[PDB]
Amino acid sequence: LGVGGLDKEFTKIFRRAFASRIFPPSVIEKLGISHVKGLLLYGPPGTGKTLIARKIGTMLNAKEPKIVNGPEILSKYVGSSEENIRNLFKDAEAEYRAKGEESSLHIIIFDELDSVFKQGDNVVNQLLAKMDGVDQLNNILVIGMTNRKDLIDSALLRPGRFEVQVEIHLPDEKGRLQIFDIQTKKMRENNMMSDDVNLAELAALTKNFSGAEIEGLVKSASSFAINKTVNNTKDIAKLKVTREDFLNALNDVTPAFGISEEDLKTCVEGGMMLYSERVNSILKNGARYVRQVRESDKSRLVSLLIHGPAGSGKTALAAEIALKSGFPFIRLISPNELSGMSESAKIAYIDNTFRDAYKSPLNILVIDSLETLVDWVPIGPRFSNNILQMLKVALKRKPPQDRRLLIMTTTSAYSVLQQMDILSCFDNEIAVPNMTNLDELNNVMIESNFLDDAGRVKVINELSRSCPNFNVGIKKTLTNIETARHDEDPVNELVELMTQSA
Amino acid sequence: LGVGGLDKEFTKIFRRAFASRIFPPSVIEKLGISHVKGLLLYGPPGTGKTLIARKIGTMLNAKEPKIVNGPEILSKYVGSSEENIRNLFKDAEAEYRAKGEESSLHIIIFDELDSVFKQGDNVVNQLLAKMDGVDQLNNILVIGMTNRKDLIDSALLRPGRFEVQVEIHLPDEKGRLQIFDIQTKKMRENNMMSDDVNLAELAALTKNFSGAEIEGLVKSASSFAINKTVNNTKDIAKLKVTREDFLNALNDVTPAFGISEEDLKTCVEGGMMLYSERVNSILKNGARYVRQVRESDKSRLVSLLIHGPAGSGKTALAAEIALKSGFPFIRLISPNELSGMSESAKIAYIDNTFRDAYKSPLNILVIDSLETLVDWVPIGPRFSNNILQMLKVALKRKPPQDRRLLIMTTTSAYSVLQQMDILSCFDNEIAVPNMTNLDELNNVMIESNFLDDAGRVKVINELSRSCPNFNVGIKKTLTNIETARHDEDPVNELVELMTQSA
Ligand SMILES: Nc1ncnc2c1ncn2[C@@H]1O[C@H](COP(=O)(O)OP(=O)(O)OP(=O)(O)O)[C@@H](O)[C@H]1O
Ligand SMILES: Nc1ncnc2c1ncn2[C@@H]1O[C@H](COP(=O)(O)OP(=O)(O)OP(=O)(O)O)[C@@H](O)[C@H]1O
Ligand SMILES: Nc1ncnc2c1ncn2[C@@H]1O[C@H](COP(=O)(O)OP(=O)(O)O)[C@@H](O)[C@H]1O
Ligand SMILES: Nc1ncnc2c1ncn2[C@@H]1O[C@H](COP(=O)(O)OP(=O)(O)O)[C@@H](O)[C@H]1O
Ligand SMILES: [Mg+2]
Ligand SMILES: [Mg+2]
């Protein structure tokens, strides 16, 4: 017909909400039952709910369904809003007096239902009157659509009202293959599509898209081929789309439920060099855990705690372990995002991020500098307890319906966490130490191209008896080489800086 | 007549509210008494109150009852609501002036009465005027309905107003047997029901349903048999519902006052293995307490405390004991449900859960992580006292009218509870210890299919002289084997991890 990827949900809606309307009234009256009058559809935006609604009605040959938007009714003036509802059902009322039980079916779609409860009452009560009360109207069927089931009051779900509930999901590979078929049919049937375009490849590149995003991608590719000829010209009849156009268009549409590439890549990495054996061990353990949470069904929530002193490398490690994983979904919470908001806004932001992470097969989250998110200052001490409780609950909840995620977190204030007794949330702890021998300094000098061997040797020979057992980090070590490089006397300057830091 | 299960109740209502209306006016005048003008019915929703109201009306062949809804009147504009109440009684006023004492009876129904008091006064005063004051009308009888008696002000219950009060209950096995007949009459009497459907079985499976759920169950079963023909065809005349349809329909309707199966089963239990004698003792004691509660009338409340270190197994034991009991009603209160709410909302939620527990023959409740529900942080220390007092009162109250329930609660901060002085609530305490011997580790490895015994011997030998006094929980032990399994060198990795944890 038109819909794609939905094959166990088009059977289950049709079995219950619609099957009885086909038969003549005699047999339905014969058994002694009643038609259902409410159906609820829930799932993330852009996934095809309104489509199913409109498309089913063409089989029954009902009237074109009316549509009403929640916030519209809520933003109208009080009296106008009150009168509006009684306007909506007028045609349905008339036809019943006209033809009794043999009237046709009428469909009403109610969108963004949750908005009414998010605080209103008059709309809800008037609406329930028309399908539950003594003024019962036996022609109508009302469809509701929401992204959040938990905000609707339980009173509405009980038998007689919104009796059947269905859930829509993001598509998998076979779904996307069918959606591509549906969207490119009309191009294919008119010899306006090249022969190198292979749809099974695109089905695998577009990893976590919804249907709407696929519409947008096709439109973009068409755009390229149009622009290639304008400046409106002869020989339009030879127009065609090509594989290169799809590959170019893939760089202009970025999906929600994707990878926050720029923040991870640029902000958190400006080098990476293996200067010791501990580093290598840390990156191997990271790979082990990524593999564990992709090939086992008895581990759907792992949490880790990379601790260490300041200037030690922590965050750059977390990022490095994530970018090599290849998961579809990756995000991070850091102080840069929460700047300038009130406390309540912060709670809302964290909660929404976690809810968005429970809608893909695989997920990674990074939490950076746990103590700064809580506003810790030791003169008081002062901190925010509400945020702490939100985080403490979140780090132990398990995603529903055989999904899975991995979490990584970074801190420099281990003792404070020990004091706040939230140290049982973590499954394992990794330690990151500083540099403490001159061999590491030699390695770091070599891989940054500091200067020729003749000078390098002299730096080590002078520090050998200037300061034998220094204790410095990596972040500071790379800001001293960089500044010393620009001096007029590089060896002496570097020696002085190193001695001061140690 | 048309209703079943509610017999006794009837006998009474008819004895008091209506018996006087049958007799001729002369004898009633002759005794020197006056009719009753108010009747209150209360009980859980969907249990059959409005049905009784209508069906009694048909025996006395009075007019069709009028109906009004509380929220409807309360939400309307102030002036319209004030003018509205006077419209409702107009017809009754007219017939009185027409025909005096010999007028027929008028019956008015008022729904969701408590909504008026839950905060209003104008409707209450105007209503009492017509049935108590000087302007009394002697034709009317008013029926009220509420789910909550305790909220109604006492001024209404005194003689002359709402003089008779009655309660409706959820049916027992015999009642459900009757309700199935009343609902399936029209199918049975027209040869559209198979010869294998046995109603005594269905009455026994549907353990805690109300009437509305039974209507829904029949409707769903009809839907199965109907859909099996379409795609609208010939031989509609051979339609028949069958036993398999009922058994499959049983999985689509879930009742309130049922079992929260998914939450108990998936989240809280992902393995169970009897690695020591203490575990067997714990489970045996749980079974003891269960069948105690089922076979005694001198123990209608029992409360338990399970305590021990973090990671020891607690919550899984609790859920494991719940699943094998076989009770109809099971729920749990845990931090996940209360996340994101304000304080007042949390209190309301807890209180409603306890109220819903007091309406079934048998009940179990599970309360998880008592110290996290109160928001304890030891720096202050800071915590919420209101929630603590609510929980402290609730754990001692006994349910009414020969019902019984069992409570289990789990915690990791035994010293804190001792400081807060709420140990007096619990009847007995159970201790869950950690692992402390190598034999237990051997059993766990055998049970989890780690690797062939040849390698298994080596782990125990190496730990026998590396660290013989280790002290770790079961959760950590089951998350270290899992990660070691995926390594390239599984023995050394597991040995190192165990040494670190101890
Ligand atoms: N082997 C390495 N491991 C980690 N970081 C490295 C390595 N080699 C170079 N670097 C660079 O060193 C810097 C380390 O700074 P980074 O922000 O990761 O430290 P940090 O301890 O998280 O800092 P802070 O806690 O003060 O915010 C980064 O620019 C990183 O790219
Ligand atoms: N004999 C057993 N006893 C307890 N848990 C077991 C047993 N065998 C396997 N398990 C598994 O071990 C895990 C125990 O974790 P659980 O959440 O019950 O611990 P907990 O004491 O509640 O932890 P926490 O204090 O961190 O909340 C569960 O996944 C459970 O299925
Ligand atoms: N599963 C799907 N199969 C085919 N087309 C789809 C699908 N999902 C989305 N589309 C396309 O995207 C458009 C927008 O989807 P829409 O029905 O508005 O979803 P929502 O109800 O979430 O807004 C549809 O009109 C259709 O062209
Ligand atoms: N004891 C019963 N026997 C038969 N049918 C019942 C019974 N109780 C409830 N029902 C069915 O449930 C339907 C809904 O009940 P309703 O009249 O709304 O009662 P209430 O709303 O007061 O719970 C009724 O129309 C009736 O068909
Ligand atoms: Mg950092
Ligand atoms: Mg627990």
UniProtKB/Swiss-Prot annotation, chains A, B:
Primary location recorded for the protein, binned into one broad class: cytoplasm
GO cellular component labels: cytosol; Golgi apparatus; Golgi stack; mating projection tip
Residues at which ATP binds: 43-50, 308-315
Keywords linked to the UniProt accession: ATP-binding, Cytoplasm, ER-Golgi transport, Nucleotide-binding, Phosphoprotein, Protein transport, Repeat, Transport
GO MF term (any one): ATP hydrolysis activity
Function (record text): Required for vesicle-mediated transport. Catalyzes the fusion of transport vesicles within the Golgi cisternae. Is also required for transport from the endoplasmic reticulum to the Golgi stack. Seems to function as a fusion protein required for the delivery of cargo proteins to all compartments of the Golgi stack independent of vesicle origin.
Top-rank taxon: Eukaryota
GO BP of this protein: autophagosome assembly; endoplasmic reticulum to Golgi vesicle-mediated transport; Golgi to plasma membrane protein transport; inter-Golgi cisterna vesicle-mediated transport; intra-Golgi vesicle-mediated transport; macroautophagy; SNARE complex disassembly; vacuole fusion, non-autophagic
Family in the record: Belongs to the AAA ATPase family.
Range within the parent protein: 239 to 758 of 758
The protein's name in its UniProt record: Vesicular-fusion protein SEC18
Additional note from the record: Present with 5920 molecules/cell in log phase SD medium.
Location(s), subcellular: Cytoplasm
Assembly mode: Homohexamer. Binds to SEC17.
